[PDB]
Write an enzyme that holds these catalytic residues in place. Structure first.
Site, PDB file in Angstrom:
ATOM      1  N   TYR A  15      32.460  82.912  43.750  1.00  0.00           N
ATOM      2  CA  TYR A  15      32.827  81.582  43.276  1.00  0.00           C
ATOM      3  C   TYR A  15      33.346  81.613  41.846  1.00  0.00           C
ATOM      4  O   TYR A  15      34.110  80.728  41.446  1.00  0.00           O
ATOM      5  CB  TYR A  15      31.631  80.636  43.394  1.00  0.00           C
ATOM      6  CG  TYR A  15      31.128  80.488  44.812  1.00  0.00           C
ATOM      7  CD1 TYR A  15      31.885  79.823  45.769  1.00  0.00           C
ATOM      8  CD2 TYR A  15      29.906  81.021  45.196  1.00  0.00           C
ATOM      9  CE1 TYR A  15      31.435  79.688  47.068  1.00  0.00           C
ATOM     10  CE2 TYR A  15      29.448  80.890  46.494  1.00  0.00           C
ATOM     11  CZ  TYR A  15      30.216  80.223  47.425  1.00  0.00           C
ATOM     12  OH  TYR A  15      29.765  80.091  48.718  1.00  0.00           O
ATOM     13  N   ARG A  74      24.447  73.323  39.855  1.00  0.00           N
ATOM     14  CA  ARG A  74      25.590  74.154  40.216  1.00  0.00           C
ATOM     15  C   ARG A  74      26.901  73.444  39.911  1.00  0.00           C
ATOM     16  O   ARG A  74      27.851  74.061  39.417  1.00  0.00           O
ATOM     17  CB  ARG A  74      25.515  74.544  41.692  1.00  0.00           C
ATOM     18  CG  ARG A  74      26.622  75.487  42.134  1.00  0.00           C
ATOM     19  CD  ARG A  74      26.559  75.767  43.625  1.00  0.00           C
ATOM     20  NE  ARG A  74      27.694  76.571  44.071  1.00  0.00           N
ATOM     21  CZ  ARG A  74      27.966  76.838  45.344  1.00  0.00           C
ATOM     22  NH1 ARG A  74      27.188  76.361  46.305  1.00  0.00           N
ATOM     23  NH2 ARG A  74      29.020  77.579  45.656  1.00  0.00           N
ATOM     24  N   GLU A  98      41.201  74.175  54.711  1.00  0.00           N
ATOM     25  CA  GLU A  98      40.918  74.962  55.908  1.00  0.00           C
ATOM     26  C   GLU A  98      42.183  75.597  56.473  1.00  0.00           C
ATOM     27  O   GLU A  98      42.206  76.795  56.780  1.00  0.00           O
ATOM     28  CB  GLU A  98      40.233  74.088  56.957  1.00  0.00           C
ATOM     29  CG  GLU A  98      38.916  73.501  56.487  1.00  0.00           C
ATOM     30  CD  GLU A  98      38.078  74.508  55.724  1.00  0.00           C
ATOM     31  OE1 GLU A  98      37.527  74.143  54.664  1.00  0.00           O
ATOM     32  OE2 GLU A  98      37.974  75.666  56.180  1.00  0.00           O
ATOM     33  N   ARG A 138      10.501  73.563  43.166  1.00  0.00           N
ATOM     34  CA  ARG A 138      10.285  74.895  42.624  1.00  0.00           C
ATOM     35  C   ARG A 138       8.844  75.368  42.734  1.00  0.00           C
ATOM     36  O   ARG A 138       8.598  76.571  42.608  1.00  0.00           O
ATOM     37  CB  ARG A 138      10.722  74.960  41.152  1.00  0.00           C
ATOM     38  CG  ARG A 138      12.186  75.331  40.955  1.00  0.00           C
ATOM     39  CD  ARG A 138      13.016  74.129  40.545  1.00  0.00           C
ATOM     40  NE  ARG A 138      14.201  74.510  39.783  1.00  0.00           N
ATOM     41  CZ  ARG A 138      15.449  74.367  40.220  1.00  0.00           C
ATOM     42  NH1 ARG A 138      15.681  73.842  41.414  1.00  0.00           N
ATOM     43  NH2 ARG A 138      16.467  74.742  39.455  1.00  0.00           N
ATOM     44  N   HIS A 184      22.226  80.506  48.135  1.00  0.00           N
ATOM     45  CA  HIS A 184      22.904  81.798  48.075  1.00  0.00           C
ATOM     46  C   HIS A 184      21.961  82.918  47.654  1.00  0.00           C
ATOM     47  O   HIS A 184      22.101  84.052  48.126  1.00  0.00           O
ATOM     48  CB  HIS A 184      24.099  81.718  47.125  1.00  0.00           C
ATOM     49  CG  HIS A 184      25.116  80.696  47.522  1.00  0.00           C
ATOM     50  ND1 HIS A 184      24.835  79.348  47.581  1.00  0.00           N
ATOM     51  CD2 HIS A 184      26.413  80.825  47.889  1.00  0.00           C
ATOM     52  CE1 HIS A 184      25.915  78.690  47.963  1.00  0.00           C
ATOM     53  NE2 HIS A 184      26.887  79.563  48.155  1.00  0.00           N
ATOM     54  N   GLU A 202      38.959  81.771  49.305  1.00  0.00           N
ATOM     55  CA  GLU A 202      38.571  80.452  48.828  1.00  0.00           C
ATOM     56  C   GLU A 202      39.391  79.982  47.631  1.00  0.00           C
ATOM     57  O   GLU A 202      39.244  78.827  47.218  1.00  0.00           O
ATOM     58  CB  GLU A 202      37.066  80.419  48.535  1.00  0.00           C
ATOM     59  CG  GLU A 202      36.218  80.260  49.812  1.00  0.00           C
ATOM     60  CD  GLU A 202      36.425  78.901  50.484  1.00  0.00           C
ATOM     61  OE1 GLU A 202      37.242  78.116  49.981  1.00  0.00           O
ATOM     62  OE2 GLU A 202      35.804  78.610  51.527  1.00  0.00           O
ATOM     63  N   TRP A 206      14.892  84.580  32.796  1.00  0.00           N
ATOM     64  CA  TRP A 206      15.766  83.700  33.568  1.00  0.00           C
ATOM     65  C   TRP A 206      16.149  82.462  32.766  1.00  0.00           C
ATOM     66  O   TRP A 206      17.319  82.061  32.743  1.00  0.00           O
ATOM     67  CB  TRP A 206      15.089  83.301  34.879  1.00  0.00           C
ATOM     68  CG  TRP A 206      15.743  82.140  35.567  1.00  0.00           C
ATOM     69  CD1 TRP A 206      15.357  80.832  35.516  1.00  0.00           C
ATOM     70  CD2 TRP A 206      16.901  82.184  36.410  1.00  0.00           C
ATOM     71  NE1 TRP A 206      16.202  80.059  36.276  1.00  0.00           N
ATOM     72  CE2 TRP A 206      17.158  80.865  36.835  1.00  0.00           C
ATOM     73  CE3 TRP A 206      17.744  83.209  36.848  1.00  0.00           C
ATOM     74  CZ2 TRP A 206      18.223  80.546  37.675  1.00  0.00           C
ATOM     75  CZ3 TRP A 206      18.801  82.891  37.680  1.00  0.00           C
ATOM     76  CH2 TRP A 206      19.030  81.570  38.085  1.00  0.00           C
ATOM     77  N   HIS A 224      30.332  71.791  59.597  1.00  0.00           N
ATOM     78  CA  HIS A 224      30.629  71.850  58.190  1.00  0.00           C
ATOM     79  C   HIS A 224      31.864  72.728  58.034  1.00  0.00           C
ATOM     80  O   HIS A 224      31.885  73.850  58.558  1.00  0.00           O
ATOM     81  CB  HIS A 224      29.421  72.394  57.380  1.00  0.00           C
ATOM     82  CG  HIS A 224      29.546  73.829  56.977  1.00  0.00           C
ATOM     83  ND1 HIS A 224      29.207  74.867  57.819  1.00  0.00           N
ATOM     84  CD2 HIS A 224      29.952  74.400  55.818  1.00  0.00           C
ATOM     85  CE1 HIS A 224      29.410  76.015  57.199  1.00  0.00           C
ATOM     86  NE2 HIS A 224      29.861  75.760  55.984  1.00  0.00           N
ATOM     87  N   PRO A 225      32.919  72.239  57.384  1.00  0.00           N
ATOM     88  CA  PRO A 225      34.267  72.783  57.612  1.00  0.00           C
ATOM     89  C   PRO A 225      34.345  74.299  57.497  1.00  0.00           C
ATOM     90  O   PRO A 225      33.962  74.889  56.485  1.00  0.00           O
ATOM     91  CB  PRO A 225      35.104  72.095  56.530  1.00  0.00           C
ATOM     92  CG  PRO A 225      34.348  70.847  56.199  1.00  0.00           C
ATOM     93  CD  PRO A 225      32.902  71.198  56.341  1.00  0.00           C
TER      94      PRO A 225
HETATM   95 ZN   LIG Z   1      37.155  77.561  52.582  1.00  0.00          ZN
END
Ligand SMILES: [Zn+2]
Lengths: 195, 707
Positions: B496, B254, B356, B150, B486, B383, B458, B326-327
């Site tokens: 998400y 996360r 997938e 950071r 992100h 997703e 924050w 990366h899938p």
């Molecule tokens: Zn996906």
């Protein structure tokens, strides 16, 4: 008493575009229509009125072989009473169709890396097509009310677009070669019989 | 009429757009499956050719009035065209913005953090810092990597980010949206008829509500994890305060998945890992995807196309092909569906494969829609459709009738709690994290948080909403939110959040259609044609309908219910409560791991308030911290014969008030973890308290230290 030149229509090097579909006149020859229907090279062989089975024991005045190229999703539109960009604007069949519709996948001969774009189709037309009518005009299409004056712009589009045939496409987007046989019976010599 | 004009306009756009992106998708697939420099160029060329055409068609569509159009499906197509991807910005302020975005991506990708006793061992985020924050049980080591990531990289983004929200607002306002947040929340803005429309501000109200309904289940999971982490960090976690932000299993917190070895309910029983059975039975990549294809077709869905098998990349190749693997699930277009994934024979990659192909199944269904409507209903549908398949397949029942589990295998309730928790640390632990992040950004884009309050506000929301406290205080030189991929790559984050709610809405709905009896986490949709037809009916509409309706014809509710989620976790919720009977549930907003060793300072109000001649600002704070460092420097040399070169960088100010009060503690110069104990700092101040009052002209009742 010779053999009809079907090898010119089916085994042709390049086919015609659908908007500019080709027609070959066939007369004064013997035709064995059982080779076509009993060939395993085709994906579609549909007939209307006449019967595929053993009807190469008929006679006709003239036989007409139309040929063009479309994508797989548009093969359904080569039939009586169908609607769509192809059946309305490029190739229309009458309700009382007396003939057959033959097709086969041509991804091997008409698809190219980077994309083959030589095959075109009509996207806009002021009205639908009469059966067996061909429109090879290139007039700028007027969608609005401002006069296009033969130049494409806002609400003024060029009527012909270009099929993007890539070899990696799905089957519905892969090119298909189509041959539409038309049987004509006039009060006339009836030259093409076929045993 | 103005509907025909737009009907023919879209007819031409479709005819050109379809192949303009397919050649673009092909060009980026050529790159991802063979990394080169020719493919980077062939990609950027087709990408520019696509973007330029999309700009052209968004302008030419702008002058198509939506008011006078009496068809809804063609209404939505124009909406996408006008809303997105226009120019509303000057060429200089646009170039300026593009440089800011590339800089933020490059800095995040290439930044590194060096070691305190070896400055030449500098370590990138991937895979160096990822591996540390995910596996280390060393407090100080994680604190170094957390703070180091950071200060070395986050601070670099603070000036870039400040300029980045300004140019995003200035652009968003030009699209006639309130903020850049308003522009992001447009994806949920539907039109509905036979009903009331979903608005952009209704998303914020539904999201606040859903969090308040998650707070109970989270507070208990947060309390149980806190009690467990106390065993491995006895003197660093207060049993009633917040959680140190560097002990949550990764750099940001996360997910809490990497806390399972420290929070496992019953360690003696392992979790189900199929990998060994797959190997011993000789499974390969093909067997995994064929078993996923067999699963989908068992639900009355279509099997894959031989274009998918013959053209996708299921494994890492031979002959030195550099591949970003990366899938991902590519809908290149024109019915060309592929999957790029370096699959291995594991259970993790077994579930991911079903995820997938879940994306491909969604892609195939709405392929019949016009190009602009070939997408999920909202940004959370894709997703979530992916993860619902992963849910039903990971069940012991499914593995049992696959040959990967003995028929004599038992499912006892001790392991069920293990599984439920392993899910909760990932699914439920991320929901408060995901919610406060987007809230902070929404509040920053609105302007409700001045740049001088960014990090103050924050972390207030971190202790209040997520209940995690920063291990060291950060002033406005930091940009800690931008430390996440992100945030520094201009991607939404609420997707998400919503996907998680939609996921379990779908799950609870399909398990009812499949007549599944028993607990919800043991559900399985395989071999249910009833449940698959209703699913394909939702996947087929794509983006051509109000997502409220699209969701209404699956789960029977127009609205966004977190009920199914809490219903899925009731077994763990009732177990956590009984396991929390002896410990505290909740957190103490004001506690911090540096608090007790800090010293409260009281700025003198030489005149009442607001007389700004005196009433100190950022520059006086530097002088104060340097004066403290001197006192610490002088102390150690005169009392311990040690040359310890403190600085302003070693004096950490917390609890800042508007020129009224604050705290401060001191750390060893090149080691943030070792804090100088408070009694020693008090002595160092006494020794030079006459020297600190002089520089500020205060007289020892004006400058006080509470002790
Ligand atoms: Zn996906």
């Amino acid at each position: 008493t010779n053999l009809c030149p079907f090898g010119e229509v089916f085994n042709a090097t390049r086919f015609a575009s659908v908007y500019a579909w080709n027609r070959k006149r066939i007369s004064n020859c013997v035709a064995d229509y059982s080779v076509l229907y009993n060939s395993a090279s085709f994906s579609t062989f549909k007939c209307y009125g006449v019967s595929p089975t053993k009807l190469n024991d008929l006679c006709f005045t003239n036989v007409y072989a139309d040929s063009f190229v479309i994508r797989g999703d548009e093969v359904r539109q080569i039939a009586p009473g169908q609607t769509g960009k192809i059946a309305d604007y490029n190739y229309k069949l009458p309700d009382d169709f007396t003939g057959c519709v033959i097709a086969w996948n041509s991804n091997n001969l008409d698809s190219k890396v980077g994309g083959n774009y030589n095959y075109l189709y009509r996207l806009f037309r002021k009205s639908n097509l009469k059966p067996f009518e061909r429109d090879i005009s290139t007039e700028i299409y007027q969608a609005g009310s401002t006069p296009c004056n033969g130049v494409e712009g806002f609400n003024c589009y060029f009527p012909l677009q270009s099929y993007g045939f890539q070899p990696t496409n799905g089957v519905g987007y892969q090119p298909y070669r189509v041959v539409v046989l038309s049987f004509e019976l006039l009060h006339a010599p009836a030259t093409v019989c076929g045993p | 009429t103005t509907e025909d004009e737009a009907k023919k306009f879209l007819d031409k756009f479709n005819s050109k757009a379809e192949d303009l992106s397919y050649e673009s998708s092909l060009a980026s697939w050529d790159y991802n499956t063979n990394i080169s420099d020719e493919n980077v160029q062939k990609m950027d060329e087709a990408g520019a050719k696509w973007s330029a055409f999309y700009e052209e068609q968004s302008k030419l569509a702008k002058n198509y009035p939506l008011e006078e159009i009496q068809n809804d499906t063609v209404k939505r197509q124009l909406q996408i065209l006008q809303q997105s991807g226009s120019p509303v910005l000057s060429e200089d302020k646009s170039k300026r913005l593009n440089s800011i975005l590339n800089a933020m991506s490059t800095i995040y990708s290439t930044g590194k953090v060096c070691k305190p006793n070896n400055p030449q061992e500098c370590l990138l985020l991937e895979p160096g810092l990822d591996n540390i924050m995910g596996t280390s049980k060393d407090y100080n080591e994680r604190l170094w990597a957390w703070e180091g990531w950071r200060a070395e990289v986050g601070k670099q983004l603070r000036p870039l980010y400040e300029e980045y929200v300004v140019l995003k607002n200035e652009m968003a306002r030009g699209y006639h949206y309130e903020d850049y947040g308003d522009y992001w929340r447009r994806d949920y803005e539907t039109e509905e008829s036979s009903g009331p429309g979903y608005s952009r501000d209704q998303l914020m109200k539904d999201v606040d509500r859903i969090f308040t309904e998650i707070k109970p289940l989270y507070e208990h999971l947060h309390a149980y994890v806190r009690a467990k982490l106390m065993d491995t960090y006895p003197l660093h976690i207060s049993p009633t305060g917040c959680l140190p932000a560097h002990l949550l299993g990764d750099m940001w917190g996360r997910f809490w998945t990497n806390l399972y070895p420290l929070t496992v309910p019953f360690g003696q029983k392992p979790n189900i890992d199929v990998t060994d059975a797959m190997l011993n039975q000789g499974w390969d990549a093909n067997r995994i995807f064929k078993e996923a294809e067999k699963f989908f077709v068992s639900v009355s869905l279509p099997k894959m196309t031989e274009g998918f098998w013959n053209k996708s990349m299921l494994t890492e190749p031979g002959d030195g092909r550099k591949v970003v693997c990366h899938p991902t699930a590519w809908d290149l277009g024109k019915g060309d569906f592929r999957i790029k994934m370096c699959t291995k024979v594991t259970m993790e990659d077994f579930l991911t494969a079903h995820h997938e192909m879940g994306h491909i199944q969604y892609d195939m269904a709405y392929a019949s829609q016009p190009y602009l409507l070939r997408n999920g209903a909202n940004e959370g549908f894709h997703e979530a459709v992916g993860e619902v398949m992963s849910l039903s397949v990971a069940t012991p029942k499914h593995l049992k009738t696959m040959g990967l589990l003995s028929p004599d295998f038992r499912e006892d309730d001790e392991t069920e709690i293990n599984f439920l928790l392993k899910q909760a640390l990932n699914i439920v632990g991320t929901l408060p994290f995901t919610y406060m992040l987007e809230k902070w950004r929404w509040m920053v884009f609105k302007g409700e948080i001045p740049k001088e309050e960014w990090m103050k506000k924050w972390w207030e929301m971190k202790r209040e909403i997520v209940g995690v406290v920063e291990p060291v205080p950060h002033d406005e030189t930091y940009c800690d939110p931008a430390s996440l991929f992100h945030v520094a790559n201009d991607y939404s984050f609420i997707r998400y959040y919503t996907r998680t709610i939609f996921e379990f809405q779908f799950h609870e709905a399909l398990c009812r259609i499949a007549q599944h009896n028993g607990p919800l986490h043991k559900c399985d949709i395989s071999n249910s044609t009833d449940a698959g037809k209703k699913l394909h009916q939702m996947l087929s509409v794509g983006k051509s309908q109000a997502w409220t309706k699209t969701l209404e014809d699956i789960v029977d509710s127009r609205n966004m219910d977190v009920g199914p989620l809490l219903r899925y976790f009731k077994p763990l919720y009732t177990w956590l409560q009984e396991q929390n009977r002896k410990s505290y549930v909740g957190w103490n907003t004001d506690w911090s791991p540096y608090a007790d060793q800090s010293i409260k300072v009281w700025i003198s109000l030489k005149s009442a308030l607001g007389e700004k001649a005196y009433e100190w600002n950022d520059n006086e704070m530097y002088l104060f911290r340097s004066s403290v460092a001197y006192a610490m420097r002088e102390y150690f040399l005169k009392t311990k014969n040690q040359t310890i070169l403190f600085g302003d960088e070693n004096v950490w100010v917390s609890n800042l008030k508007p020129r009224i009060s604050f705290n401060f503690h001191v750390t060893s110069p090149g080691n943030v973890s070792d804090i100088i104990p408070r009694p020693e700092v008090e002595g160092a101040i006494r020794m030079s308290r006459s020297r600190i009052n002089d520089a500020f002209r205060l007289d020892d009742n004006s400058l006080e230290f509470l002790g």
